[PDB]
């Protein structure tokens, strides 16, 4: 019988559950990458009420095999090409493994100092991957946190650059109080300005097009900001893109930063996917100009092989946050770097990725994902049939079928690819039209999974044409 | 060497860590409970880069063992009587490693409908455990949804109601929004205002004190709103406490909720701790008059065996929510739940409750709590036995609020010292709070190894350091 906590038995079932997963990994293609269940499919396979006895964990498994798996779409899968990789790796599997059996919440030092210290550590060992500036370091007036997700990262630093501006003005003036950003910035940024209260009329998104390939153009923003600063409004937050969603577009740190840092406005840089790469050489040419940044964000739970969740925010000042965020009327109290109180011990997974890896092997990680992604598209511009839509910057390739009512052709594409389950992917929309995206991030991919995804997508859009 | 994913590996390095974790609570009790290290003691340790070329497991669990353990405050010792318990079980230990293997991201229905459906029905399955009205189940126009804590459940609460009133009446009334609460709420109220734009001198932090044992008393509530309406404020949002921090103080919901629904004040429920005991028919009457609640919140990572996070949020109405939360313009089918939170992302995180549920069963669960609180009854006694100490308020569920009574000798309060040497003594962890501003000390019995040979341990300590200070 399984109690509450017993060590031994936490051992046997452990062991079971590791053969468990490990199985789920050795044969992870034979599923469907997409789930293909219906909308309800599960309340008609489990009971509507807890059991009052004990249920075995063989039955546990055997749900999670029937019941469970199917409605699974796995993210994992070496054919998983949609939206943004979310790695998984043994070494943050063995980091989740320990933070849970740890079980500590590390709101503030005494709470497990280790928590807060090899947080801060971490955080420096990735900025200095980086090579970012000296701002960003735990040593100097910046720092670094480990947040729940870029979502939350972001709305800290609005609600951190709002409130700097609030309390030299007074909270009358949140009406006045104007966001910026490309029509390329993701959704976050939109829902961080609701939750912290800024008026809609006041989320300036400046268009980009093709000229630029959807990077943002400075001297927009410099006309927006003047045209806002005549109408008696407050610039306050902008965020720019370092690999957007949509289309992998990189927008000039430089020239926003100037712009940023000459009106007092808050610059965040939003490196959630693509800051990853730039622990290469080759690549961190993209965050040129971070140096102007008051905040800089990028997921180590995408693309640098650690188990979400594991967003890092980098801030050059960290007593706008802690001022805008303490409940008080030496030491990092974390608490007064988020949202939430508590936390978990997330530093430990980003740590043992880094030292069971090494930066060497996360750098040919990146470069082999990229080369994958370049095959990828190779084999696209040789089909007449397909177009490349933008340039491919990292591992991500936009394309789509070449144009020949009412049909999508594109999307009926995707849809019976997807169906397939032979292999997921997913759409996005540039200048009104839709784009068919091919994200190669999961660390099981191989080139024989993209030759045989091309190969899919091949034969399905020949039969759809005919 | 290590790839970055190989089930084979996986295997193996699995078991390894499920050893090493499994030494770790097996020997917990060798480790003092608080740490007891210097602050920055670790930067010292670790280089201050990451290396070039991997390193092995077996260095890493070493590190582990000798730099990081010495810095690590042990929550699940059995002796931790600090705060609140977070936490940890088998089943909830397998659920988090399932989740992590699995390694979804359920942001939306699509991306894996099982991680949305089974947190639907298992948030039902728990609001049948506490006999929630039928306004929180899935089937109505509520709902239930898991939070990464309660500080979020509260903050997405207050983001609802203020954007349902200001989209009523206009973002300018923003100024004018009140929001009411105890002087004993926790501080993630406050910390959800700030972030929400509520203007500080509309936060109403009514005061309690011993003649309702620190329970808000509904007609000051009353007087409030109508003082604020009078004076041409809005009330829209109250928080009452089931079972506060400080000393599991209970507010009377009934009558508060009677005020705030006739008022339009949305009614928020912070059960974060006690929820869990109102599985036990016993314990359920101090969430009687949850039915006039907008929302109700218990922390499923605290008192319910399920390792954080799970905070565990129900509302009447989840349009409240969505329409508050979503960034879709046009958009009024099926849940997606990243219109419920703040982060995009989410982990599989239904996994782990749904094994500790099954697991355990809802009567193991409910001895579990009893076996708690009957341990904190021992504790209490053994208390009341000593001259030297007193019970400071009355005891309801695993906590108990105690002191050294100050003695006029030759006036002193020894009670911060008695801590600071129980603490320092690495044999047990507890905290303090402050009630009417006096200095109070707690212990509150929340670890599943704890026995009561460990409860009559720390009392034990707790007396030989106080007679060491009295003298
Ligand atoms: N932001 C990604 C989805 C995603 C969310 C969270 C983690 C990973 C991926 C997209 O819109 O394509
Ligand atoms: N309630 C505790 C914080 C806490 C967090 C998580 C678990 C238990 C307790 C406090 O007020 O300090």
Known sequence: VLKPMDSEQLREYGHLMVDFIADYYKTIEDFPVLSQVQPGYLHKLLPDSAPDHPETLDQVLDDVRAKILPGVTHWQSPSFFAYYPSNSSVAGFLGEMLSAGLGIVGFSWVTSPAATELEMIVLDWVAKLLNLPEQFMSKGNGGGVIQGSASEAVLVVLIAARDKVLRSVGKNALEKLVVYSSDQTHSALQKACQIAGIHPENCRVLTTDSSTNYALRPESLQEAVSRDL???????????????????????????????????????????????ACICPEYRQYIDG?????????????????????????????????????????????????????????????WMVLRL????????????????????????????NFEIVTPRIFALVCFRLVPVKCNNRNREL?????????????????????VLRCAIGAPLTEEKHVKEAWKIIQEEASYLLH
Not at 296 to 323: E, G, Y
């Open 230 to 276: 005549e109408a008696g409004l407050i610039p306050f937050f902008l965020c720019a893109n370092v690999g957007t969603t949509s289309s992998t577009a990189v927008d000039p740190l430089a020239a926003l930063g100037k712009i940023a840092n000459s009106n007092g406005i808050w610059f965040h840089v939003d490196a959630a996917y693509a800051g990853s």
């Open 290 to 350: 971070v140096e102007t940044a008051d905040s800089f964000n990028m997921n180590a739970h995408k693309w640098f092989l650690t188990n979400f969740d594991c967003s890092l925010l980098w801030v050059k000042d960290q007593d706008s946050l802690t001022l805008a965020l303490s409940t008080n009327p030496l030491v990092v109290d974390y608490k007064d770097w988020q949202i939430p109180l508590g936390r978990r011990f997330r530093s430990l997974k980003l």
């Open 357 to 384: 890896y090494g930066s060497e092997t996360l750098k040919s990680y990146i470069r082999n994902h990229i080369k994958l992604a370049k095959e990828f598209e190779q084999l696209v511009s040789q089909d007449p």
């Open 414 to 434: 995707l849809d019976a690819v997807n169906s397939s389950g032979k292999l997921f992917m997913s759409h996005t929309a540039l200048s009104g039209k839709i």
